[PDB]
A paper describes a structure:
The dense glycan shield consisting of 22–23 N-glycosylation sequons per protomer is an essential feature of SARS-CoV-2 S architecture.
To further structurally verify this, we determined the cryo-EM structure of the BA.2.86 S-trimer in complex with hACE2. Consistent with binding results, both the N354 glycan and T356 are located far away from the interface. However, we noted that variants with the N354 glycosylation exhibited very high affinities to hACE2, reflecting that tight binding might be required to further recover the compromised infectivity. Surprisingly, all single mutations except for L455S identified in JN.1 displayed, to some extent, increased binding affinities and single reverse mutation of D450N, H445V, and P486F induced an ∼3-fold affinity increase. Structural comparisons revealed that the substitutions of N417K and H505Y established extra hydrogen bonds with D30 and E37 on ACE2, and mutations, including P486F, H445V, W452L and L455F-F456L augmented hydrophilic interactions of the microenvironment, increasing binding capabilities.
Residue numbers in the entry:
A (entry chain A): 19 to 615
B (entry chain B): 333 to 482, 484 to 527
């Protein structure tokens, strides 16, 4: 009689059909990615086409249930997440225009090529050519050439395409009752109808702004130290008070400063932690690495891996006969089947990545009992954070000594931990202003506060104001330089990394408090504490059926993102850094540029 | 010294689906029960009304054996006084039942690549079933208000499929189930232990 029970029915049918269809599609994707052929491409294409047809059919059918007459919260969330028609609300002509533009962006970004000005037939891709060029070369001119050539080759092509992309995205956002596409992406963190846990679409903006306001001081201090080191290295290219050149940040866009460690290391004579020699000496292989990570997860009380995981997952490069793409990815095929695919090498890097991937696997297995439409993280930012926190825990030298990979005679000291935290800062602190920059720029572009003929002007002005980076070569509005990034050109939200950065350290602080550990957080380990495991599982089982705020409180007891874990975790590095920065200028002037003399 | 077709019931090939549970009638035997032990490593042996070691010392008038296949969780679901989609729409077991249940893992005979779609089960029925009922319905369901005809938007075909494949988890794995029912009622018992 009532409509909510009809929705219950329809969902009961949909879950069972979708389990089988999605299993078929994802198994086709797996057998493609483990074995690169053509007929595998055909099979995965057929499976994905069937899956997409099923999705559009189900959305079209279930759209007739009005949400205003559902009281059960889980049913409401299921039917809402189902009902988002997305692109199909727009006309078919504009829809095919959009998908053609998307494919055009993908082809230009993945196949963009730049040639050196001396040999027209010798040209390089971004990966691995330009990536290696600006990740390994110390020559100013080569880095500048790579940066400028890549940008002038890709952004000029992608500019009008991105303009029409934004136009259609705004149109479809206004069709779906959103003011802008940025609001469409901000809709991910939205919850309603739960007292004491609600969250508005402007609340995310306010929260991220306030958090960046608190996180800035460490950032200008690190900027000053890195500027001093770079001026020491490059006296004639860097002003003591000006912004850093873009092509001197270690990667293609200044995303991470992980590269600049070799030049900015405080103490270059202290040994670094690397148990790769321990890997080879004890003849460790992939099976032993993953059994290690297994017993690591067991130590907190998490279950074993399933027999199918060890049996059928591909734990090594499949030789040379068959080719595979082994970007570290965890696959949740459903029906109680979980898999891992990545080319294991005997290094400590792969040792950490294995723990990260198995953290993903444990997350996926924890909410396996939830229905099909809710088998996902409480929001987008929980999966990768939970993956990275296990790696952070395993990277502690205490665990290495405990598991017999570091000699007990190794002497921990202030210098080594200072080096370690500076590495972690160059990896983590460097990216936060850049992600904030890119996401806020995209947001104000979508909202319309920046007319077309000064997008890039406002972009670089705000960079020199906030991230403290100045371009080495002037650009006009003919460029689409932001599109030179994977995420910008290929339709992904980017505030996810800032949210993940806050979340992982909130989790780490909470669990380390639960583990009754004493001393610096960077030396904290959670192993052999079943209380930590049960605390983790108490949110692991939830999925996304309840508000993400409740899930966060289930772990930390707080209902919002907060910056105290980050600053507390980096505090000793903060006091060291302010100690050094007494004889250097803090802050950056926006007026100085390399090309202004 | 005539024995039951116990081999002929525990070694078939086409155990019917749960929506039509195949019933074999057992009588005029002597009842070897070492075969109830040696056959397969087993996964579940929950006996309710009879001691599982003290069964050879009993005489029964009639005994019924029902065999069908279900998923892993449903094996735990088959029990006196339970709830769920297999215990309320396909098979109901009486609260006063006295017998033993059997559950072992079938991964080599009843399993295939490219999917298996020959088996079915029923998620939709107007009400609850009564103990020991067979119901091969063919009608189309109805929501609460529409005089619908055929497979309406709120009127569905109440049969689904057990997609079976050999790369599935143990929890979703296709177990083989047969249930053994006795009757302790005063009548000439035609089956007894040696
Ligand atoms: C990859 O697929 C090709 C095409 O069928 C096949 O010949 C080859 O054996 C496969 N390699 C595997 C499964 O390792
Ligand atoms: C929603 O429905 C599910 C299953 O139908 C039930 O377990 C849950 O208690 C219901 N919750 C509310 C608030 O109605
Ligand atoms: C499964 O977990 C238990 C509990 O720690 C452990 O004893 C057992 O060895 C694990 N299984 C395997 C195959 O190692
Ligand atoms: C955890 O407990 C096990 C069992 O005694 C022990 O072998 C291992 O060294 C412990 N690890 C830590 C980090 O305490
Ligand atoms: C079923 O019968 C065949 C011969 O008809 C026999 O080989 C097989 O072992 C029997 N099944 C089992 C599980 O013993
Ligand atoms: C069980 O199946 C066999 C063969 O399909 C059939 O001959 C027999 O009558 C069935 N018994 C039932 C449905 O009780
Ligand atoms: Cl850039
Ligand atoms: Zn990951």
């Amino acid at each position: 009689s009532t409509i909510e029970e009809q929705a219950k029915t329809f969902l009961d049918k949909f879950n069972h059909e979708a389990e089988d269809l999605f299993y078929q599609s994802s198994l086709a994707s797996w057998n493609y990615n483990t074995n690169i052929t053509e007929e595998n491409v055909q099979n995965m294409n057929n499976a994905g086409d069937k899956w997409s047809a099923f999705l559009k059919e189900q959305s079209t059918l279930a759209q007739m249930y009005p949400l205003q007459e559902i009281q059960n919260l889980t049913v409401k969330l299921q039917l809402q997440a189902l009902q988002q028609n997305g692109s199909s609300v727009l006309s078919e002509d504009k829809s095919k225009r959009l998908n053609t533009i998307l494919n055009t962006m993908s082809t230009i970004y993945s196949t963009g090529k730049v040639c050196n000005p001396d040999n027209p037939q010798e040209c390089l891709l971004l990966e691995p050519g330009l990536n290696e060029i600006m990740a390994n070369s110390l020559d100013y001119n080569e880095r500048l050439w790579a940066w400028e050539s890549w940008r002038s080759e890709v952004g000029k092509q992608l500019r009008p395409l991105y303009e029409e992309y934004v136009v259609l995205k705004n149109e479809m956002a206004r069709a779906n009752h959103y003011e802008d596409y940025g609001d469409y992406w901000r809709g991910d963190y939205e919850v309603n109808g739960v007292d004491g846990y609600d969250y508005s679409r402007g609340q995310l903006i306010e929260d991220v702004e306030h958090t960046f306001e608190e996180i800035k001081p460490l950032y200008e201090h690190l900027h000053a130290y890195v500027r001093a080191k770079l001026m020491n290295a490059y006296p004639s290219y860097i002003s003591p008070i000006g912004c850093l050149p873009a092509h001197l940040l270690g990667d293609m866009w200044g995303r991470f400063w992980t590269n600049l460690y070799s030049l900015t290391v405080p103490f270059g004579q202290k040994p670094n932690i690397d148990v790769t020699d321990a890997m080879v000496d004890q003849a460790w292989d992939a099976q032993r690495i993953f059994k290690e990570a297994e017993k690591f997860f067991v130590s907190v009380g998490l279950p074993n891996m399933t027999q199918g995981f060890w049996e059928n997952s591909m734990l090594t490069d499949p030789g040379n006969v068959q080719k595979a793409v082994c970007h570290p990815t965890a696959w949740d095929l459903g029906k109680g089947d979980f898999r891992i695919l990545m080319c294991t090498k005997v290094t400590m890097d792969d040792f950490l990545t294995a723990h990260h991937e198995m953290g993903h696997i444990q997350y996926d297995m924890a909410y396996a009992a939830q229905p099909f439409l809710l088998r996902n993280g409480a929001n987008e930012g929980f999966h990768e954070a939970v993956g990275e926190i296990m790696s952070l825990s395993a990277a502690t030298p205490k665990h290495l000594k405990s598991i017999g990979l570091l000699s007990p005679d190794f002497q921990e000291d202030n210098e080594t931990e200072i080096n370690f935290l500076l590495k972690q800062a160059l990896t983590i602190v460097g990216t936060l202003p850049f992600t904030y920059m890119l996401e806020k720029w995209r947001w104000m572009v979508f909202k319309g506060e920046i007319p077309k003929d000064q997008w890039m002007k406002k972009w670089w002005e705000m960079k020199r104001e906030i991230v403290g980076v100045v371009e080495p070569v002037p650009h006009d509005e003919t460029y689409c330089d932001p599109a030179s990034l994977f995420h910008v050109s290929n339709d992904y939200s980017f505030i996810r990394y800032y949210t993940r950065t806050l979340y992982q350290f909130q989790f780490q602080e909470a669990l380390c408090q639960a583990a009754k550990h004493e001393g610096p957080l960077h030396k904290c380990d959670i192993s052999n504490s079943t209380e930590a495991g049960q605390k983790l599982f108490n949110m692991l089982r939830l999925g996304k059926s309840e508000p993400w705020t409740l899930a966060l409180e289930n772990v930390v007891g707080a209902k919002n993102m907060n910056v105290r874990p980050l600053l507390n975790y980096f505090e000793p590095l903060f006091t060291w850094l302010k100690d050094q920065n007494k004889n250097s200028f803090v802050g950056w002037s926006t007026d100085w540029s390399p090309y202004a003399d | 010294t005539n024995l039951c077709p116990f081999h002929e019931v525990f070694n078939a090939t086409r155990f019917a689906s749960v929506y039509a549970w195949n019933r074999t009638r057992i009588s005029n035997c002597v009842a070897d029960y070492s075969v109830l032990y040696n056959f397969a490593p087993f996964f579940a042996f929950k006996c309710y009304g009879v001691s599982p070691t003290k069964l050879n010392d009993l005489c029964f008038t009639n005994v019924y054996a029902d065999s069908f296949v279900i998923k892993g969780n449903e094996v735990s679901q088959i029990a006196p006084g339970q709830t769920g989609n297999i215990a309320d729409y396909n098979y109901k077991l009486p609260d006063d039942f006295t017998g033993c249940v059997i559950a072992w893992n079938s991964n080599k005979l009843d399993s295939k690549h490219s999917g298996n779609y020959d088996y079915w089960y029923r998620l939709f029925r107007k009400s609850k079933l009564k103990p020991f009922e067979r119901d091969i319905s063919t009608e189309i369901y109805q929501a609460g208000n529409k005089p619908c005809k055929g497979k309406g938007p709120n009127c569905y075909f109440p049969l689904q499929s057990y997609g079976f494949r050999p790369t599935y988890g143990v929890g979703h794995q296709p177990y083989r189930v047969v249930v053994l029912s006795f009757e302790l009622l005063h009548a000439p018992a035609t089956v007894c232990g040696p």
